[PDB]
Amino acid sequence: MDIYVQCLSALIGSCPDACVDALLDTSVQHSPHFDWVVAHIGSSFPGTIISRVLSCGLKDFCVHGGAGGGAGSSGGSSSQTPSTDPFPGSPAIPAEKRVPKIASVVGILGHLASRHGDSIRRELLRMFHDSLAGGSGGRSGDPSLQATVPFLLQLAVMSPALLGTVSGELVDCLKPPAVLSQLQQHLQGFPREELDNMLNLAVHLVSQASGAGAYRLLQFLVDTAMPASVITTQGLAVPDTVREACDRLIQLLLLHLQKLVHHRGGSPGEGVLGPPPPPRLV
Amino acid sequence: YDIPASASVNIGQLEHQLILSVDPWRIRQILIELHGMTSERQFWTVSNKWEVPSVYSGVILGIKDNLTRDLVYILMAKGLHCS
Numbered sequence: 001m002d003i004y005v006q007c008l009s010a011l012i013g014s015c016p017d018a019c020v021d022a023l024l025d026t027s028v029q030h031s032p033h034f035d036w037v038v039a040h041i042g043s044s045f046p047g048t049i050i051s052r053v054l055s056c057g058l059k060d061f062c063v064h065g066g067a068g069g070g071a072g073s074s075g076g077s078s079s080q081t082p083s084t085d086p087f088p089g090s091p092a093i094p095a096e097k098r099v100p101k102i103a104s105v106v107g108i109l110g111h112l113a114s115r116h117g118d119s120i121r122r123e124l125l126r127m128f129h130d131s132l133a134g135g136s137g138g139r140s141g142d143p144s145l146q147a148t149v150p151f152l153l154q155l156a157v158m159s160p161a162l163l164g165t166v167s168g169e170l171v172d173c174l175k176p177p178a179v180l181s182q183l184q185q186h187l188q189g190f191p192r193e194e195l196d197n198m199l200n201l202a203v204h205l206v207s208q209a210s211g212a213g214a215y216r217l218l219q220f221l222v223d224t225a226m227p228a229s230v231i232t233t234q235g236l237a238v239p240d241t242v243r244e245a246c247d248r249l250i251q252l253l254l255l256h257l258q259k260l261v262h263h264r265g266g267s268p269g270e271g272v273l274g275p276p277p278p279p280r281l282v
Numbered sequence: 283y284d285i286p287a288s289a290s291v292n293i294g295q296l297e298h299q300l301i302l303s304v305d306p307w308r309i310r311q312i313l314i315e316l317h318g319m320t321s322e323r324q325f326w327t328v329s330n331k332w333e334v335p336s337v338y339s340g341v342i343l344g345i346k347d348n349l350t351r352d353l354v355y356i357l358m359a360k361g362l363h364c365s
Contacts, residue, residue, distance in 0.1 A: 260283075264294040271301065271329040279330070 001030075006046045009064070013057025022214070023065040031070055040071035042085040044098070052092030052137075065101055070116075072107050080107070084114040088133050096140035103144070112141050112151045123172035124165070138176045141269075152184050153191065160196050166203030167211050174218040182225040189226070194247060196239070201251045206275040215254070216261055223262035224269075224282060285295045293320065297328045304316065304364075306357055317349045332359040 005027040012020035031040050044067045047060060067277045071079060087099040115137030122130030141148060141238060153172075159169035182188065192200070204211055240246040241255035269280055286292050293316065300312040316325055326332070326358035334355065335341060335348075342358065 049346055261291065264291050267298060272297065272327065272333065273330055274327055275330040275332065 002046070005043065006051060009047045009057070009060035010051035012109040013051055013060040015056045016058070018059075019219065021059055024059055028063060028066050028070075031067055035070075035074075037071040037074050037076035037079045039213070040067040041076070041079045044068045044071065045086045045090075047094065048088045048094065052095075052098055054281065056094075061101070064098070068102055069104070072102060072104060073107065080110050081114070084111060088114075088118060088137070091133060091136055096136060096143070100140045100144050106143055107206070108141075108146060109151070111137075115141055116151065116155055119172050120169060120178060123168050123175070135176070135179060138180060142183075149184050149187055151189050152187065153185075156188070156191055156196075160199040163203040163206055166200070167207045167214075170200070170218075171211075171214045171266075172201070174214065174221065177225075178217075178221050182221070185222075186229045187225045189229070189236060197251050197272035198247045201254070202247045205250070215258070216236075219261050220265050223265055224259075234237060289319070298324070299354075301329050304360070309356060309360070310353055313348060313353055317352070322348050324348055324352060326355040326359075332356070332361070334359050 005023060008020040008023040012024070027043075031043065034040075035213065044064045047064045051057075051060065071083070084099070087095055100108075102108065102111075115134065118130070118137055119134030122134040138142060141151075155169070155173060159166050159173060204215070207214075222233075231282070237255055237259060241252055241259055244252055246252035266282065268282065273280055284295075286295070296312060296316055300316070302310060302311050303312060313325065338358075343351055343357050345354070
């Protein structure tokens with residue numbers, strides 16, 4: 001039954017035929033009768049592991065979306081966790097197009113949390129495949145630009161709490177930010193009022209030359225960022241660097257160094273960008 | 283600040299001073315120092331504002347030595363801007 005349904009869905013997706021409309025309707029009816037979230041999640045996963053990388057489908061896609069919605073109607077924390085794990089395990093072709101197709105608030109939040117955990121693990125392991133999976137998850141979350149500020153705030157709060165894994169969490173966040181364009185630049189600037197800076201300085205004190213290089217790269221990315229409110233960020237940085245308003249002398253020195261580095265980077269992009277090609281927008 | 287302990291920012295400051303400079307001799311010194319402490323990479327493409335007529339660009343850049351071509355390119359561009 002399940003094998004036949006998966007075959008019909010794959011055939012519909014590859015060749016746009018109506019021979020799978022009644023089969024999809026019957027499968028949907030059976031799934032609601034079963035009321036098995038795990039069964040629906042497994043059925044959706046079989047239809048996306050290999051039935052989603054061949055060709056785009058409409059009826060099969062709708063059937064898979066309905067099955068996923070039925071699975072997610074109940075709590076199904078374990079099913080969501082195994083479902084998220086199967087998606088990262090099989091990140092083939094439209095893995096994001098399938099996992100992110102839920103378009104539900106709770107499902108999106110769970111997927112964002114799972115992607116953040118996967119990215120943290122990838123950063124800790126320094127593995128290319130894990131980093132690629134984390135980047136794919138971040139990109140999938142970015143396309144669903146519904147609500148990422150709470151997830152970013154939670155990740156930032158978690159990172160400053162630690163000192164050993166704080167550097168790794170910060171590096172992972174900076175790396176995802178370089179591809180996400182720092183959408184919540186204003187939020188990132190605002191949160192670090194008085195104590196986040198001290199916690200981050202303490203955490204980075206356990207860092208090394210790799211931490212310094214990551215900080216320089218993050219400073220460059222931030223300089224090539226902050227479109228919404230750049231004046232606020234610049235004022236916050238200058239007050240803590242020239243005004244000596246930083247809670248830590250090391251923090252103030254780091255702020256001054258970051259300002260100098262950002263100025264140098266802008267000057268490079270500003271002048272040595274090239275006369276032939278058009279300018280790069282800052 | 284001088285002596286930044288980093289070659290990249292040192293090069294950035296050096297080329298900034300090169301752009302700011304107006305004396306041909308000091309420009310020569312800065313550019314030859316840059317060529318020495320870098321690879322054989324052309325450095326006339328460090329300030330896009332600098333302009334050179336397309337008619338004379340072929341001849342000005344048709345010099346085998348990167349150092350000499352960059353020196354002459356920067357000298358003529360800066361002097362034309364001054365004019």
